């Protein structure tokens, strides 16, 4: 009987992580008129 | 006798008619401030400013 070990030995990895995410708008708002007429 | 009651019906009732108005735009008044119903976490607002 055998088998494929891997040595294990101590490495200095970085701990980061990548959120994905979608740009928006940090406040929209939209014109209406309030009154009937004519745009002048 | 000053008057006669057909004129007093007449008065009284757009009386009745106005304090009926007066409610209801008390009422619709009221309504222009939103309010939360409850009491909890409230999220994104579905809704724009100046929206309809």
Do not use: H, M
Not at chain 1, 2 to 31: D, H, K, S, W, Y
Not at chain 2, 35 to 52: D, F, K, M, Y
């Amino acid at each position: 009987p055998e088998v494929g070990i891997v040595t294990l030995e101590a490495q200095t990895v970085t701990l980061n992580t990548e959120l994905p995410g979608r740009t928006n708008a940090f406040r929209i708002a939209e014109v209406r008129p309030q009154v009937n007429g004519i745009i002048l | 006798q000053a008057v006669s009651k057909q004129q007093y019906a007449d008065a009284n009732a757009a009386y009745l008619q106005s304090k009926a108005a007066v409610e209801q735009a008390r009422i619709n008044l009221r309504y222009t401030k939103v309010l939360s119903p409850i009491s909890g976490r409230i999220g994104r607002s579905a809704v724009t400013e100046g929206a309809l």
